[PDB]
Amino acid sequence: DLKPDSISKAITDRLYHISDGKILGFIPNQYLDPESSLIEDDFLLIYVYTYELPLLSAVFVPEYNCYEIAITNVAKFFSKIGVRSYPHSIKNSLLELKELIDNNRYDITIYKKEFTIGAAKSSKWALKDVVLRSASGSDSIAKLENQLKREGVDKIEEDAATRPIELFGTRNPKTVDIIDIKNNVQMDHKDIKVTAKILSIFDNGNNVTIYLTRSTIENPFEELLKVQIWGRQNLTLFFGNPNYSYKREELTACIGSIVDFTLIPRVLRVNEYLYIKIWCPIYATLESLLIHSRL
Amino acid sequence: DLKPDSISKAITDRLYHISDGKILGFIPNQYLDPESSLIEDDFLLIYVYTYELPLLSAVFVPEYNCYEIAITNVAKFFSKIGVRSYPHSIKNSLLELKELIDNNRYDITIYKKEFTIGAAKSSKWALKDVVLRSGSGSDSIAKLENQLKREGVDKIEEDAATRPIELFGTRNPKTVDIIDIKNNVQMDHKDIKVTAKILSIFDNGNNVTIYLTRSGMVGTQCTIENPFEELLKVQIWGRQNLTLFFGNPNYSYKREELTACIGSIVDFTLIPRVLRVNEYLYIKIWCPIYATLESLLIHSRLE
Amino acid sequence: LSPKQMKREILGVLIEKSMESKVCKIYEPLLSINLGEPVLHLKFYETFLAQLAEMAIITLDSFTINMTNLHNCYRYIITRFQSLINVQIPQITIKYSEIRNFCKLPLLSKKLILQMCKHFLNTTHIGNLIDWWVDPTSEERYKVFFTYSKS
Amino acid sequence: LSPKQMKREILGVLIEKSMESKVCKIYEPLLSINLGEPVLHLKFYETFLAQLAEMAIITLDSFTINMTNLHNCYRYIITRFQSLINVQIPQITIKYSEIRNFCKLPLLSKKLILQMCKHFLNTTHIGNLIDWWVDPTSEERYKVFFTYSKS
């Protein structure tokens, strides 16, 4: 069966069908990127729920209870789904995208798209077509955010990714596999460790992304882990200066070194009342990676 | 070397010497017995610190950093140490004893004293003589209780022995031997499982005490050579807990029912609790969780 | 009153109890069957508790049963299956590893997981479910089929 | 300065840091030795830290040194030995298991327990201690003798 964790079993040039899907949200967006941050191809991600999948709370987990899907051509996607202000206005385009995914459901066509992370080649789901389907029964996502509008978002924002990063204080934290992290599916609050090889580290403007592997990557679910840093204080601490300055090949210099990370779970807003779970390294600095890199 | 855990190496009928001791407190007292519970002979215990020993906190541990010592004649001890209202006023005498032990240090003489629990014979410290003594230099104990007097005892009183007993919620707790419990010296706040054989089980009025031993020993007709390593004392205090243990608000039972679970092997779950022995000083103890006489008695007639 | 339907009766009693409280007396479940004694009989009852404890779904004193792991395992089953009922999904394929990994109870057996799901499908009142069927398809997977009265 | 002296140097820096703060950056201890960029003998330093972590007196990050266990361990060494100095005891026998059991550190070795105790005896300012000697009597026990200027 097509499942958010089943890309290693997917075949190339083969179209796969998500019937009756809810587009939960998308990154980037107005909640993570204020200002009209010009959206490039392949850097727009969407997150899709099917009602067969577990529904724990307003925090969804990619590769578990939602699909992370790359948009290969934004203009076609916005044109086909019903967006009308692109590319003149990024802000109004995403506002229009929000109204359409909040109200409708879609049949979605995806395929296993090969792509490179630095030198390694891996897979990712890419969107091919989107088709509005007729309205109707009840909607668990709509019920969930109706409860969320009454109750406290405050507790979820306690785990927002920009909140400054502190050690939880777990006694003798345990080293863990990437699989085990992917199966770590609620919001636990405890320090966990992982030992992994740096595939690449990207400066994305207002966040830093670190691709990690334990192993061409046949099974990105089991063997690839994306780790991110958000926020002024967190980023300032990573670079060692408040301007996010660094030399070009300092990020390159870290590729290939095995690094032990301590992670805590954080939360990224993808819609007004919906979030995805992410992992963040604790007290990471380019400094120490760089100094360790020379070893 | 005389130590609170060294009674196994003590010779019988020899007097041992405690230099410059701080009597931390005593049991019973105002805190564990409201109203003057008649202090019988053998049933008055004092707890003595010596400054060689480690100071962890206001929660002290017998057989580790303080001596549990039995008083074998209350009236001799009270006379010897300076109590002047005994026995005309039982509770005004404990007031004078608290004054004397809070402001003075003493040179104490103790001996190994043999006493029987059920059908086994074991040892305990007993006080022979006490002598007044008085030096400059700050008192680490008084420093401790002046700190407690400012910040409060509320966190330690959460572990008072009379609080209703319930599980802390430890995720999958490990079974452990008696040696390991006796070496457990801090206020861990976690559930500890132990399998052990019941030696005896006394109703001391306002508390029940269950004496536990290693499970693989012949009957109960023997001698306990190292009570520190071999003998575990698990206690139950408080209306809620005793009512639940017996099954009655009246603490009602029939005499042969206690001695009937002697010899039975029980899986206990234990938590650390605390007995107040002075104004700002305490001793660590162990208590069984949801232990009931009925379930012991049922468990016994199956085995 | 066959041996394996005694195990169904106990397991369901433990499940209902574990939603109220995480603890109960060891013999309280045996007490709720016999009103709602031979030593050979309740040995069988304690042999079953030992088998459940061997899988870590409960832990045991001589006094009480700790149903914490049962509580959190059954809470996931409620969460998972109430979600499917409200959308009125006709069928679902489920991996046993899904429940073990979510609860971190990797010694849970196929039989026990199907019994807990079956118990919920007999228990629940919310929704329009009125019939169901469970297919023990494979070593890793089972299917559950749902039937509803309204649409 | 030498093989053993760099190890003693590092172990001592960690011990003083762990009273100040329970956490620090991996290279703070190395930087407080040198200046108080290009080096290449980091391997020895990292190798040493990893050996301590095998015993869990510290736990290790590629970015952070967690000294909680080191703090809880050295704190007990202060409490134990400062007490013996206060009363000016001439000698004591100590089982290694006592420090292990207290701090929940089964993998602590003889060498480190003695090194940590010797650090305290060279460092302490409280008392009339002036000389001391550590006899590693057995695998279970070690004896420590104290010598005082005054009585």
Side-chain angles (χ1 to χ4, degrees):
Chain A
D1 302 310
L2 179 60
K3 237 69 191 185
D5 69 355
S6 77
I7 198 170
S8 84
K9 293 162 182 180
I11 284 96
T12 310
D13 292 298
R14 176 92 157 72
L15 294 178
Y16 297 92
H17 297 91
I18 290 156
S19 246
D20 192 26
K22 184 80 178 180
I23 302 170
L24 300 164
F26 47 84
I27 290 168
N29 54 51
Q30 76 176 113
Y31 306 101
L32 312 181
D33 295 60
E35 305 144 314
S36 59
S37 315
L38 297 171
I39 309 159
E40 307 138 322
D41 300 315
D42 261 287
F43 289 75
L44 176 70
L45 300 183
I46 70 170
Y47 299 90
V48 171
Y49 178 83
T50 62
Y51 292 86
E52 32 130 8
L53 299 179
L55 218 190
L56 323 170
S57 64
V59 178
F60 293 80
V61 180
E63 300 174 315
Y64 167 74
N65 71 334
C66 71
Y67 298 85
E68 182 171 73
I69 298 169
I71 303 311
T72 67
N73 182 276
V74 176
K76 166 170 159 155
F77 174 65
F78 285 8
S79 172
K80 181 69 173 215
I81 197 167
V83 170
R84 294 176 172 170
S85 284
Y86 187 80
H88 176 53
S89 172
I90 301 300
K91 182 183 193 166
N92 280 357
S93 290
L94 303 185
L95 277 178
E96 287 156 10
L97 184 57
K98 194 196 149 177
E99 294 304 289
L100 289 161
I101 67 163
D102 279 350
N103 300 331
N104 309 278
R105 295 192 212 170
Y106 297 93
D107 294 330
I108 295 175
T109 308
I110 58 172
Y111 57 97
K112 163 148 141 175
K113 185 165 185 301
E114 178 186 307
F115 82 116
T116 68
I117 306 175
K121 304 172 198 195
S122 196
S123 299
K124 77 190 180 190
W125 299 115
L127 178 144
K128 156 78 174 173
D129 203 25
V130 51
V131 171
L132 203 172
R133 59 148 52 209
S134 296
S136 35
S138 58
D139 180 353
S140 329
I141 303 306
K143 288 175 176 181
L144 213 207
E145 52 204 21
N146 282 334
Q147 270 191 358
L148 244 301
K149 202 187 167 184
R150 306 166 178 177
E151 290 169 348
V153 160
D154 287 359
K155 186 164 195 165
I156 290 177
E157 301 291 354
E158 289 190 299
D159 295 338
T162 53
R163 227 193 163 198
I165 284 159
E166 292 175 0
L167 257 186
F168 185 74
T170 300
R171 294 172 184 172
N172 294 324
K174 287 158 178 153
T175 293
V176 152
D177 224 65
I178 289 175
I179 311 153
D180 303 312
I181 294 162
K182 300 294 189 63
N183 297 333
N184 199 326
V185 129
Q186 305 178 295
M187 297 297 292
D188 192 24
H189 294 93
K190 94 158 54 162
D191 304 312
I192 65 159
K193 296 171 91 75
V194 60
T195 293
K197 181 184 172 167
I198 292 181
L199 268 185
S200 234
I201 145 168
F202 299 94
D203 175 3
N204 307 322
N206 66 348
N207 69 88
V208 168
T209 282
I210 308 181
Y211 283 94
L212 300 174
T213 197
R214 297 192 98 257
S215 29
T216 299
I217 297 159
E218 302 295 336
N219 194 334
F221 176 62
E222 299 199 355
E223 292 152 14
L224 187 61
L225 174 66
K226 176 166 115 193
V227 141
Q228 338 174 27
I229 302 173
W230 294 74
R232 249 173 269 112
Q233 291 187 54
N234 293 326
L235 286 173
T236 286
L237 200 95
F238 175 80
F239 292 112
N241 65 75
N243 308 312
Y244 312 161
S245 303
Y246 61 91
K247 298 174 197 174
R248 48 164 192 183
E249 293 187 343
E250 283 180 328
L251 304 182
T252 319
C254 302
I255 301 163
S257 50
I258 283 86
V259 183
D260 318 325
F261 291 91
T262 312
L263 314 170
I264 53 161
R266 290 298 192 78
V267 113
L268 272 193
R269 214 173 168 186
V270 304
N271 207 329
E272 192 174 14
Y273 300 105
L274 306 170
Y275 306 76
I276 64 158
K277 178 181 188 191
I278 70 167
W279 294 98
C280 304
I282 301 167
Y283 309 144
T285 73
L286 176 54
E287 258 254 79
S288 300
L289 284 187
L290 218 58
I291 273 63
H292 179 71
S293 168
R294 323 239 170 192
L295 219 70
Chain B
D1 282 40
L2 178 63
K3 242 68 172 163
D5 65 357
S6 71
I7 206 172
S8 64
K9 292 182 172 182
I11 300 169
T12 331
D13 293 85
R14 165 170 295 187
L15 302 169
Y16 293 94
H17 287 84
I18 280 177
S19 229
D20 194 37
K22 173 80 176 192
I23 303 179
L24 298 159
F26 49 89
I27 291 175
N29 54 42
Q30 49 154 114
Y31 311 90
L32 310 170
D33 286 70
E35 303 180 330
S36 58
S37 303
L38 286 176
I39 315 159
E40 299 141 33
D41 297 328
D42 258 320
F43 299 107
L44 172 75
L45 298 157
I46 71 163
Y47 297 94
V48 177
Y49 174 77
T50 48
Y51 291 83
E52 30 135 351
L53 299 172
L55 230 210
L56 309 183
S57 70
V59 175
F60 292 75
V61 195
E63 301 170 301
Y64 168 79
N65 71 345
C66 70
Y67 297 89
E68 187 170 75
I69 307 172
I71 271 50
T72 75
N73 187 284
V74 176
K76 170 175 171 146
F77 179 68
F78 279 15
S79 163
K80 205 83 196 157
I81 198 176
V83 168
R84 291 297 205 270
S85 282
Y86 196 68
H88 202 108
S89 185
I90 309 279
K91 201 195 169 197
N92 202 107
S93 284
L94 296 191
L95 284 174
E96 298 171 355
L97 178 71
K98 195 173 163 191
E99 273 293 308
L100 290 155
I101 69 178
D102 277 350
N103 291 311
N104 309 295
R105 293 189 200 159
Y106 296 91
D107 287 328
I108 293 180
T109 301
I110 59 171
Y111 56 97
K112 184 156 146 149
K113 176 177 219 281
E114 179 195 303
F115 81 124
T116 67
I117 308 153
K121 309 228 173 193
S122 197
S123 315
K124 75 183 184 190
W125 298 118
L127 182 139
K128 167 72 191 189
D129 209 58
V130 61
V131 169
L132 184 50
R133 169 146 186 182
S134 77
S136 68
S138 107
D139 184 1
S140 46
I141 298 295
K143 181 179 162 179
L144 213 209
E145 57 188 47
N146 285 347
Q147 290 159 359
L148 264 290
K149 189 177 165 188
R150 275 135 48 200
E151 56 184 295
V153 286
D154 306 48
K155 289 181 179 194
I156 296 175
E157 285 274 296
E158 270 169 57
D159 303 316
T162 46
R163 304 292 170 274
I165 293 160
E166 18 124 53
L167 281 163
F168 196 84
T170 302
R171 287 180 184 179
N172 297 283
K174 295 172 164 191
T175 305
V176 143
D177 292 327
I178 289 185
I179 327 132
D180 310 309
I181 296 163
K182 303 299 285 296
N183 293 304
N184 198 323
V185 131
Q186 315 184 255
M187 291 299 297
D188 220 282
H189 295 85
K190 67 167 49 178
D191 312 316
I192 296 281
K193 288 194 162 172
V194 56
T195 295
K197 166 138 66 190
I198 294 183
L199 227 198
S200 194
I201 168 174
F202 294 89
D203 179 312
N204 310 306
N206 60 340
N207 68 277
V208 176
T209 297
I210 301 170
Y211 286 87
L212 299 174
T213 204
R214 174 182 48 88
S215 42
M217 76 173 205
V218 198
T220 46
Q221 301 288 160
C222 48
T223 314
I224 287 166
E225 300 289 357
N226 192 334
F228 167 69
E229 290 190 347
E230 288 156 15
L231 186 72
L232 172 63
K233 196 180 135 180
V234 163
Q235 315 194 41
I236 304 186
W237 298 70
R239 273 178 209 147
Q240 235 114 125
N241 298 320
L242 296 172
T243 299
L244 210 51
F245 170 75
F246 294 110
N248 320 116
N250 301 327
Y251 310 154
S252 158
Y253 67 92
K254 285 179 193 178
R255 292 181 195 172
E256 298 187 322
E257 292 188 314
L258 298 182
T259 43
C261 11
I262 290 177
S264 62
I265 285 81
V266 178
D267 291 347
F268 293 94
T269 305
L270 300 175
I271 51 152
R273 288 296 180 86
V274 125
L275 280 186
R276 197 169 190 188
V277 307
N278 208 326
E279 209 160 284
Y280 308 97
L281 299 169
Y282 293 84
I283 67 164
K284 185 188 187 185
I285 64 162
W286 295 97
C287 307
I289 302 184
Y290 313 143
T292 55
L293 182 58
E294 199 200 70
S295 296
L296 279 171
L297 217 47
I298 265 69
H299 178 90
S300 216
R301 290 182 195 183
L302 303 159
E303 191 179 13
Chain C
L1 310 166
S2 54
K4 302 190 171 181
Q5 290 181 38
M6 299 275 305
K7 296 184 179 185
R8 254 205 205 100
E9 196 88 45
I10 289 159
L11 196 254
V13 153
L14 287 165
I15 287 183
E16 292 292 305
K17 286 262 194 186
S18 55
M19 297 301 302
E20 312 157 15
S21 172
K22 286 166 207 189
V23 176
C24 78
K25 299 183 161 178
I26 293 201
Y27 300 116
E28 276 291 291
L30 197 65
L31 258 54
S32 73
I33 306 172
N34 288 357
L35 292 176
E37 315 220 351
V39 181
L40 302 172
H41 176 64
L42 62 132
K43 266 182 182 172
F44 173 81
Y45 167 82
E46 291 181 298
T47 311
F48 181 42
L49 295 185
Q51 286 170 13
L52 300 182
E54 273 186 82
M55 313 165 55
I57 198 115
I58 52 168
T59 55
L60 294 166
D61 307 65
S62 304
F63 307 110
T64 62
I65 308 166
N66 179 347
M67 302 175 287
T68 287
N69 305 344
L70 181 60
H71 170 94
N72 282 309
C73 186
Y74 192 68
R75 236 283 108 78
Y76 178 63
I77 285 162
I78 293 163
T79 298
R80 188 69 155 94
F81 282 86
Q82 204 77 66
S83 156
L84 300 166
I85 279 158
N86 305 329
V87 171
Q88 295 196 355
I89 274 122
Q91 62 174 287
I92 181 94
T93 303
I94 293 167
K95 289 190 176 187
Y96 296 107
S97 56
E98 200 179 305
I99 291 91
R100 296 161 174 147
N101 287 350
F102 186 98
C103 309
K104 302 181 167 193
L105 301 181
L107 293 177
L108 291 188
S109 67
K110 295 149 219 163
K111 185 180 181 194
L112 179 65
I113 288 175
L114 300 179
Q115 283 165 337
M116 294 186 287
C117 298
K118 278 170 182 180
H119 179 275
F120 170 83
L121 296 166
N122 281 315
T123 287
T124 184
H125 320 293
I126 306 127
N128 309 135
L129 181 77
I130 192 132
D131 201 11
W132 54 267
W133 182 248
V134 165
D135 186 0
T137 39
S138 175
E139 284 287 329
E140 297 79 26
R141 303 186 183 195
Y142 64 103
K143 297 203 206 300
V144 178
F145 300 83
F146 310 96
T147 296
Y148 311 89
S149 64
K150 300 190 193 74
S151 59
Chain D
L1 267 162
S2 93
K4 307 288 107 164
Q5 282 177 31
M6 254 276 191
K7 293 183 169 185
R8 184 188 299 120
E9 208 91 293
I10 293 160
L11 197 255
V13 172
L14 288 164
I15 288 180
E16 293 295 309
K17 287 260 186 178
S18 66
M19 313 305 294
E20 302 168 352
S21 195
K22 304 206 178 193
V23 162
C24 77
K25 305 179 64 164
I26 6 77
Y27 300 127
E28 270 182 55
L30 189 62
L31 266 60
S32 97
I33 291 176
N34 291 341
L35 290 154
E37 313 156 339
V39 188
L40 296 177
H41 77 89
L42 297 328
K43 274 169 197 173
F44 187 82
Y45 177 82
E46 284 190 1
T47 285
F48 182 56
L49 293 178
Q51 287 173 0
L52 300 182
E54 288 168 39
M55 309 153 52
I57 190 76
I58 54 162
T59 45
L60 248 184
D61 223 12
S62 270
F63 307 109
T64 305
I65 300 176
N66 190 329
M67 295 168 293
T68 301
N69 296 340
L70 178 54
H71 173 81
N72 297 328
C73 187
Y74 197 67
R75 203 185 214 173
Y76 182 71
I77 289 185
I78 296 169
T79 293
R80 189 69 158 92
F81 281 81
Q82 196 65 73
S83 241
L84 301 173
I85 284 164
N86 292 340
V87 189
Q88 300 205 353
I89 268 104
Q91 64 161 293
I92 187 80
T93 304
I94 292 177
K95 300 188 202 174
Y96 294 102
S97 67
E98 171 180 18
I99 290 102
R100 295 200 187 100
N101 295 333
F102 184 94
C103 318
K104 309 185 169 194
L105 289 171
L107 299 167
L108 263 177
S109 62
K110 284 166 288 175
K111 187 211 268 272
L112 195 67
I113 291 163
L114 302 185
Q115 278 169 313
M116 286 186 286
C117 296
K118 295 182 190 179
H119 187 266
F120 174 75
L121 298 166
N122 295 329
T123 295
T124 182
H125 319 289
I126 302 171
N128 297 137
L129 196 71
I130 192 154
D131 200 27
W132 55 267
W133 170 253
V134 175
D135 179 18
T137 27
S138 58
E139 182 90 14
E140 298 194 16
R141 283 160 200 84
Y142 66 101
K143 287 177 187 185
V144 178
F145 303 79
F146 310 88
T147 298
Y148 307 86
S149 48
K150 309 166 173 175
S151 45

